[PDB]
Amino acid sequence: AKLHDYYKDEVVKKLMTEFNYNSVMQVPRVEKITLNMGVGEAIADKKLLDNAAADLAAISGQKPLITKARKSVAGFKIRQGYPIGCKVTLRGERMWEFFERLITIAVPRIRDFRGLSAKSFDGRGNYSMGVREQIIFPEIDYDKVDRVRGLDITITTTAKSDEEGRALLAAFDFPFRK
Amino acid sequence: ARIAGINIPDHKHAVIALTSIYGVGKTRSKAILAAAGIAEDVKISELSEGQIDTLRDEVAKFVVEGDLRREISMSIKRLMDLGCYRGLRHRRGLPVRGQRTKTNARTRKGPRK
Amino acid sequence: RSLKKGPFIDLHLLKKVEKAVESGDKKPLRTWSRRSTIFPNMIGLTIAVHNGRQHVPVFVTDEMVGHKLGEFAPTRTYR
RNA sequence: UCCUCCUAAAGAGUAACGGAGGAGCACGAAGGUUGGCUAAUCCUGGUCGGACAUCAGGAGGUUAGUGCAAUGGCAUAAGCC
RNA sequence: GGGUGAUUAGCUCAGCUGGGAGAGCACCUCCCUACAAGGAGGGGGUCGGCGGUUCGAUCCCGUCAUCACCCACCA
RNA sequence: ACGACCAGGGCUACACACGUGCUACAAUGGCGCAUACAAAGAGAAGCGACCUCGCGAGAGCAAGCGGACCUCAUAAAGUGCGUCGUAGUCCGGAUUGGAGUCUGCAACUCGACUCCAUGAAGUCGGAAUCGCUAGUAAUCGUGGAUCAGAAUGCCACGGUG
């Protein structure tokens, strides 16, 4: 593990040179990465969610758990906390464990891209990267590609503005450009 | 299945195994082997004997999928709003090398009922 | 598909190309030929093409060189 | 027949074929409890793609919920686990 | 004024414990020979409008638009 | 004037199906390499050898021939080895991008030839329909006309049978 150690020394610890604070403890931090994988056309049975979560847990270090629904989804018979997908939310060391597998070894299904925008916005500085699939990691034999399954990513941080979060964006090796 | 790329064939001839996945031509699919000493004979189905696990970056270091699409779409980069022949014939799903549309047109739009 | 190192323009057009920046005073070149191509040497000149019904001005920029007048006054419509 | 507000007079009952609406069955669970937990709605942003539609962030607050219409407690939750 | 029931393929109409649509006859294309006929192949749904109950509503509830039908009821 | 001189269009535009020509879906097969057995015809701004160059199309040096001379031009199926083995296939390449060749005053539209890179369909076929009586049906090869440049349509001759 090297990328979280880079976050402990090389990221925002000199930010007082560019951003105004009353304490050096105000510099921005990463809180969580929620994640999402959609059940798609299996929504009306969804007993496969345990078997889909188990293969997200093949690139994540977390133990699988199943997403409960909110406000229902369409007319598919979704009621209260009905199990409907997977998040398997990342905190602490597990966030950068994943960002040392993502587009380092998990590569053979990526799309044509070269750099995501740094001047992007939400109002707090919480960045996102479009990937659509779990993009596959290579094994000694596979025999693993049939549908690959989905992936969505948006970070959550202590930042109060989009240019404060632009200094925290330094926390990753993913292609972002100024 | 799906061991050489995005395409589903189980057992395929090694000198064309990288075809139909957007990254390699018919002669390149045999030249890519002889630069690495890889066998040009007997059909393949799995990641055995180094026969294709050695070819992942040698395909990806060039124009592939959407990057190949963008390169063969250089023909229209000055025609992305200007409709002059090729422009309109790419802004909608249309022919560019002549089409005898009164026959042989199912392939342009969808199969007969 | 083989056109290289110089423009294919006729001598009646070369008498105009030498004085093309006067196209704030001079009126557009009335042309009947449509197989003809646009070239860098022609940039600054004003041209009007017969569409088989009337003469229309065609707007020319250095982006569209190597295309024919029959691509701006369209051949056998079609969409 | 049962059951609810307003009209209905700052004790209390209360008319009208007055203003207006429901029940006639369910639940081993929503029951017993120690502990733990905490919305709606509006907004910003979405994906291979949408007749419907993801999880976050911003605003907000006894505005969600309680098996069922109706009202009011309600986080000590009596809400869910 | 009062009331009963419907609205889904061109037409007849199915599909209510509340679960993302189906047949007949036409029609369209083709075969036989030229149409009628005979045969073969194929098709697409504003499943009335707006609100409310619901996870989900053509489907349960209200209310308007529409049609056909019933009816204008004691002295 | 609707002329025909001249610069130029359209006649290769598709709301939908059929006829014609044709190739694959093959294993009684296909491809590469080797090899058996040809007829007929055209050929002086032609056919163009040997030889050179150009991935190749094509270009250059340049013999002979005007008819049993010299050139198009070693005919291909067939046979023999290898190899595929239902795999939406080494097959098959619609669509399509680039780079070269060639004619022409000019080729993008509506041309041909070549080399790369990119790639869908096709696993068998509905009511129905067609041709031959013997060197015929089958089915692969080879020429001829037109003509600046380009036919898969037209005509003509062999092989197995």
UniProtKB/Swiss-Prot annotation, chain A:
PROSITE patterns assigned: RIBOSOMAL_L5
The keyword Heme is annotated on this UniProt entry: no
Designated name of the protein: Large ribosomal subunit protein uL5
InterPro entries assigned: Ribosomal_uL5 (IPR002132), Ribosomal_uL5_bac-type (IPR020930), Ribosomal_uL5_C (IPR031309), Ribosomal_uL5_CS (IPR020929), Ribosomal_uL5_dom_sf (IPR022803), Ribosomal_uL5_N (IPR031310)
Residues recorded with modification N6-acetyllysine: 2
Organism: Escherichia coli (strain K12)
NCBIfam families linked to this entry: PRK00010.1
Task of the protein: This is one of the proteins that bind and probably mediate the attachment of the 5S RNA into the large ribosomal subunit, where it forms part of the central protuberance. Its 5S rRNA binding is significantly enhanced in the presence of L18.
Keywords: Acetylation, Ribonucleoprotein, Ribosomal protein, RNA-binding, rRNA-binding, tRNA-binding
HAMAP family from the UniProt entry: Ribosomal_uL5_B (MF_01333_B)
One Gene Ontology cellular component annotation held by this UniProt entry: cytoplasm
Alphabetical list of Gene3D superfamilies matching this protein: 3.30.1440.10
BP GO terms, sorted: cytoplasmic translation; ribosomal large subunit assembly; translation
UniProtKB/Swiss-Prot annotation, chain B:
PROSITE patterns with a match to the protein in the record: RIBOSOMAL_S13_1, RIBOSOMAL_S13_2
Matches recorded under SUPFAM superfamilies: S13-like H2TH domain
Chain segments carrying region Disordered: 93-113
Subunit structure: Part of the 30S ribosomal subunit. Forms a loose heterodimer with protein S19. Cross-links to the P site tRNA and weakly to the A site tRNA. Forms two bridges to the 50S subunit in the 70S ribosome, contacting the 16S rRNA and proteins S19 and L5.
Official protein name in the record: Small ribosomal subunit protein uS13
Family statement: Belongs to the universal ribosomal protein uS13 family.
PANTHER family: 30S RIBOSOMAL PROTEIN S13/40S RIBOSOMAL PROTEIN S18, SMALL RIBOSOMAL SUBUNIT PROTEIN US13M
Outcome, altering residue 104 to H: In PW095; partially suppresses a rimM deletion
Keyword terms of this UniProt record: Ribonucleoprotein, Ribosomal protein, RNA-binding, rRNA-binding, tRNA-binding
Biological role stated in the UniProt entry: Located at the top of the head of the 30S subunit, it contacts several helices of the 16S rRNA.
GO annotation, biological process: cytoplasmic translation
Organism placement in taxonomy: Bacteria, Pseudomonadati, Pseudomonadota, Gammaproteobacteria, Enterobacterales
GO cellular component, one term: cytoplasm
MF (Gene Ontology): rRNA binding; structural constituent of ribosome; tRNA binding
From Swiss-Prot, chain C:
Listed GO biological process terms: cytoplasmic translation; ribosomal small subunit assembly
InterPro entries: Ribosomal_uS19 (IPR002222), Ribosomal_uS19_bac-type (IPR005732), Ribosomal_uS19_CS (IPR020934), Ribosomal_uS19_SF (IPR023575)
Record-level GO cellular component terms: cytoplasm; cytosol; cytosolic small ribosomal subunit
Pfam name, any one: Ribosomal_S19
MF terms in GO: rRNA binding; structural constituent of ribosome; tRNA binding
Keyword Ribonucleoprotein: yes
Domain of life where this protein originates: Bacteria
Keyword Transmembrane helix: no
Alphabetized UniProt keyword annotations: Ribonucleoprotein, Ribosomal protein, RNA-binding, rRNA-binding, tRNA-binding
Similarity section: Belongs to the universal ribosomal protein uS19 family.
Function: In the E.coli 70S ribosome in the initiation state it has been modeled to contact the 23S rRNA of the 50S subunit forming part of bridge B1a; this bridge is broken in the model with bound EF-G. The 23S rRNA contact site in bridge B1a is modeled to differ in different ribosomal states, contacting alternately S13 or S19. In the 3.5 angstroms resolved ribosome structures the contacts between L5, S13 and S19 bridge B1b are different, confirming the dynamic nature of this interaction. Bridge B1a is not visible in the crystallized ribosomes due to 23S rRNA disorder. Protein S19 forms a complex with S13 that binds strongly to the 16S ribosomal RNA. Contacts the A site tRNA.
Subunit structure: Part of the 30S ribosomal subunit. Binds S13 and L5 and cross-links to the A site tRNA.
Protein name (Swiss-Prot/TrEMBL): Small ribosomal subunit protein uS19
Lineage of source species: Bacteria, Pseudomonadati, Pseudomonadota, Gammaproteobacteria, Enterobacterales
Gene of this entry: rpsS
